[PDB]
Amino acid sequence: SRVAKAPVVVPAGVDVKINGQVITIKGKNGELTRTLNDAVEVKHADNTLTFGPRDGYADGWAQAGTARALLNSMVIGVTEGFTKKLQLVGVGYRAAVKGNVINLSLGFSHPVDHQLPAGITAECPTQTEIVLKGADKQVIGQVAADLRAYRRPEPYKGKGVRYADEVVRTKEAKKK
Amino acid sequence: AKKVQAYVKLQVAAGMANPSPPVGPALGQQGVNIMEFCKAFNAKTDSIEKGLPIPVVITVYADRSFTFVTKTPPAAVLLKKAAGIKSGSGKPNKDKVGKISRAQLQEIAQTKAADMTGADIEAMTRSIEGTARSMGLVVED
Amino acid sequence: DKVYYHHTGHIGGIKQATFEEMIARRPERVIEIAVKGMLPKGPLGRAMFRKLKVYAGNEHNHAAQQPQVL
Amino acid sequence: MLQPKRTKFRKMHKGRNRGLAQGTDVSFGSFGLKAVGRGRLTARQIEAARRAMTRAVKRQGKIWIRVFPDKPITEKPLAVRMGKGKGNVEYWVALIQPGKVLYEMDGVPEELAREAFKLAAAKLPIKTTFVTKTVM
Amino acid sequence: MKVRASVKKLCRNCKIVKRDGVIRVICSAEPKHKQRQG
Amino acid sequence: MFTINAEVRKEQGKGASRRLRAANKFPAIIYGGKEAPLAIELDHDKVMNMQAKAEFYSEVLTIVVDGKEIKVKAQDVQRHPYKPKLQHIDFVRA
RNA sequence: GAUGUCGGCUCAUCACAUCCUGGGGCUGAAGUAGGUCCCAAGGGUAUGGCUGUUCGCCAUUUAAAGUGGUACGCGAGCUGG
RNA sequence: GUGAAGAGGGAAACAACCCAGACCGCCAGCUAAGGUCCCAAAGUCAUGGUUAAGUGGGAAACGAUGUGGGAAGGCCCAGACAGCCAGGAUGUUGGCUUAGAAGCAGCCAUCAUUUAAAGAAAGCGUAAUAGCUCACUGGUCGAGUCGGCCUGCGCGGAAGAU
Ligand SMILES: [Mg+2]
Ligand SMILES: [Mg+2]
Ligand SMILES: [Mg+2]
Ligand SMILES: [Mg+2]
Ligand SMILES: [Mg+2]
Ligand SMILES: [Mg+2]
Ligand SMILES: [Mg+2]
Ligand SMILES: [Mg+2]
Ligand SMILES: [Mg+2]
Ligand SMILES: [Mg+2]
Numbered sequence: 001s002r003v004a005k006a007p008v009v010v011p012a013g014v015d016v017k018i019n020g021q022v023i024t025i026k027g028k029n030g031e032l033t034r035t036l037n038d039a040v041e042v043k044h045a046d047n048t049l050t051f052g053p054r055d056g057y058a059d060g061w062a063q064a065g066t067a068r069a070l071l072n073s074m075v076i077g078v079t080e081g082f083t084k085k086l087q088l089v090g091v092g093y094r095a096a097v098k099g100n101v102i103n104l105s106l107g108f109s110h111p112v113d114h115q116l117p118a119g120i121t122a123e124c125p126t127q128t129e130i131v132l133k134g135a136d137k138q139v140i141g142q143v144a145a146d147l148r149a150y151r152r153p154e155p156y157k158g159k160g161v162r163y164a165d166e167v168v169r170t171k172e173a174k175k176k
Numbered sequence: 177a178k179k180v181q182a183y184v185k186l187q188v189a190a191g192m193a194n195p196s197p198p199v200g201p202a203l204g205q206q207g208v209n210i211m212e213f214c215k216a217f218n219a220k221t222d223s224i225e226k227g228l229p230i231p232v233v234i235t236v237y238a239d240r241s242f243t244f245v246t247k248t249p250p251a252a253v254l255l256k257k258a259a260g261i262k263s264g265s266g267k268p269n270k271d272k273v274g275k276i277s278r279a280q281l282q283e284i285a286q287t288k289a290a291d292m293t294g295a296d297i298e299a300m301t302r303s304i305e306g307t308a309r310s311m312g313l314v315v316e317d
Numbered sequence: 318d319k320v321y322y323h324h325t326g327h328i329g330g331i332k333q334a335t336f337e338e339m340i341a342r343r344p345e346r347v348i349e350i351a352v353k354g355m356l357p358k359g360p361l362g363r364a365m366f367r368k369l370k371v372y373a374g375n376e377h378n379h380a381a382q383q384p385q386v387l
Numbered sequence: 388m389l390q391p392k393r394t395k396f397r398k399m400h401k402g403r404n405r406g407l408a409q410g411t412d413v414s415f416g417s418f419g420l421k422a423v424g425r426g427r428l429t430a431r432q433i434e435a436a437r438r439a440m441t442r443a444v445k446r447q448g449k450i451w452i453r454v455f456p457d458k459p460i461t462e463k464p465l466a467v468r469m470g471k472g473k474g475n476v477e478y479w480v481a482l483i484q485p486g487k488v489l490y491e492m493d494g495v496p497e498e499l500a501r502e503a504f505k506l507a508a509a510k511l512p513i514k515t516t517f518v519t520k521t522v523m
Numbered sequence: 524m525k526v527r528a529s530v531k532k533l534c535r536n537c538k539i540v541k542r543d544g545v546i547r548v549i550c551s552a553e554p555k556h557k558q559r560q561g
Numbered sequence: 562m563f564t565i566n567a568e569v570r571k572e573q574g575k576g577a578s579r580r581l582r583a584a585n586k587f588p589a590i591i592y593g594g595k596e597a598p599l600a601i602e603l604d605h606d607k608v609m610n611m612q613a614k615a616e617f618y619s620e621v622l623t624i625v626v627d628g629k630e631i632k633v634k635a636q637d638v639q640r641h642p643y644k645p646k647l648q649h650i651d652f653v654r655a
Numbered sequence: 656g657a658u659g660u661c662g663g664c665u666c667a668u669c670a671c672a673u674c675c676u677g678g679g680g681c682u683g684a685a686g687u688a689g690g691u692c693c694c695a696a697g698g699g700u701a702u703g704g705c706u707g708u709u710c711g712c713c714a715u716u717u718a719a720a721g722u723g724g725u726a727c728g729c730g731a732g733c734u735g736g
Numbered sequence: 737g738u739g740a741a742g743a744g745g746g747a748a749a750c751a752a753c754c755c756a757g758a759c760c761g762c763c764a765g766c767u768a769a770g771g772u773c774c775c776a777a778a779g780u781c782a783u784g785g786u787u788a789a790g791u792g793g794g795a796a797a798c799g800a801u802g803u804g805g806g807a808a809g810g811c812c813c814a815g816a817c818a819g820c821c822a823g824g825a826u827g828u829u830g831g832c833u834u835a836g837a838a839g840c841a842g843c844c845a846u847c848a849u850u851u852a853a854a855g856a857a858a859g860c861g862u863a864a865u866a867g868c869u870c871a872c873u874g875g876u877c878g879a880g881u882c883g884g885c886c887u888g889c890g891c892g893g894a895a896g897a898u
Binding site for chain 8: 527529539540541544
Binding site for chain 2: 824825826827828829830831832833835836838839843844845846847848849850856861862864865866867868869
């Protein structure tokens, strides 16, 4: 039509497996599974994978799109190693890591330590930068925000941990 | 579109330079050496028409050193001299402050030629006519 | 999305309300609740409900009649 | 304030109040705005609508009006029952589904008609025009 | 502000106005400006 | 030229007609000349798109009824009060 | 062949269209304080002067002194202005 | 027309509404209105289609890329719709104005070149320039894509006191 999804290679490391519905993948990165919906019928010839809609039911066809993509990311994650980094701006704001507990000195009375789930560590190349990186893109996303969420940037200044991309310059001029 | 430090442009008088407001801080921020350029610019500007505002593009290097190309004076300015007028019309096209012969425009087109893209003289002449019509300067053939 | 609604008795407009996904303390209750009302309503159908035996955990304490079954 | 009606002589009086039946169709401009469904088109309603057409647009061409109120609508204060039949003062047109807008110079025909359709109590389609061809 | 009924959407860059019925004119991609469901 | 297919009517009255247009088949007529008036049942959602033109009420038309010919023109046109829909159509024979 | 009026006292019970406190969105939101809208009924939600008053105005408090239903809640419970 | 002066069955309950006029008795049949999963008598009936909100099982203006159907149109395998890559130039910082106004405070003008394309410029931004994004175009990918017309069912609008 103008959209769909058909490709999903299985290079080295890509040790995909299906158990009726379940799909466990392996590789240089980690062990990620993701039992899709029920109708789902994914397989694997030698390289291309393919979702399986029990039939052309409304909530059954589109269920393919969201699927042929999720697994694909599982592959793109396991082979590349996912990264995403945010930056902290504002006086006093600092950064630090000690394995998991990424101590955070933002601007409250006492600093904190966000313990990241397993599969994604983080590194502060400086007291200003934090670069998280792991396999599963899921835990990646939530923790990406779960972190910046500790202090969302405010317009008047911009201060507050922001994704290292956020267009938000600053405010609309103040007033009263 | 896009606007970054390094390779600055400015239109400075023929034989005059160094004032802070006009020059100084402008390129001074970039790391240019005010004095050297002042004397350097006005040196060649002697040969180039004195009394004629001439735009120059200075390009600085990591060295903080720099070079600059002196081109031909602005079309608007040239049209002013040609017209014998000091200023534009304020409300161009509504009120004409001056006039210039078609011959003159060819002469200005010829002067600016180096800086203009014009494939042929007619093209050049007309790029300048465009400026004249923006200046409230009529052209009589 | 579906409550059951009981209302105790001691007013104070307490009026208890619990959803289904909220049925984690005693799943046995439901079903027995549903199967009710569909009875003659009164004495006969009242002492007729117990012939169900709740049980929420498959083959467990089948002692309710461990001896014979079908 | 406007008043499409009033402006009649004083006699003849007022009374009655019936129901309705079918509509009607006119033709005077390049674009018309017809309504669909009985309702009460009071003088105030009609002025509000029409007056809202120019609404800082343009005085271009000229708008019309096929609709025209016939007052005879009595109301009573905080008083007893059927002690008379208090004055009226209110308005009412009593349309069905007639055409009543019409536009002179094209310009923004359909556009404006919509920019001022809510003032009316009834629902009116975009309608089209005096015709012997169509649209789309 | 976040309205109750529906005030259309206006502007251009406003949200696709798609979701669980969220109108509110504003035009997102206005770092500060953000008139919407609330 | 415009070509409108059609056929004679079964009946002709309240119930009858009302039942045709209720299925995209507004009943029309065709008179003029020595030939007895013709009562047909054209296809609504197929003629309203053809009347869409200004040519429709100028140049003669060809109604394919039964399988014969006629070559006529449009006279009166009965359209719905508020629905873009169309109704009874008068046809002036040649 | 009788369903006792207003206000007060006593003692209440519910609604939510929320006054305070709790959580949010926008702001012509720097902060502090506000404006408005969403959510929210757990709990809390003034003493007096004048008047029969309800209410109201006034003095002084308070986080605040909510709107409303309950025969304009409440006389086989009090009062009788 | 019914009740009054009418019983029986139906609308949960319900003089008037729907069915229907009770001479008695019957552990015998067929029907009306209305119904057939349990309370509760009888299809968990069949052939097809809609809905996904418990709509059915309360309520308007108006609002919305919900989802069903029918007809007509706009661009497009000389390549469209979304995206990715690349460019977006010259006179010129247009004239005036202004401390400055260089596409982007404001007023006027808004031409012309070079072109595959390139507004004297759509927003952000600078003290003003620098810089960022936009209109437009080339390459990529290769089939639909973008709205209205008429209609089905549905959603929001939707706050109350034991
Ligand atoms: Mg019973
Ligand atoms: Mg509320
Ligand atoms: Mg008091
Ligand atoms: Mg009372
Ligand atoms: Mg007593
Ligand atoms: Mg007394
Ligand atoms: Mg009697
Ligand atoms: Mg039978
Ligand atoms: Mg049964
Ligand atoms: Mg319901």
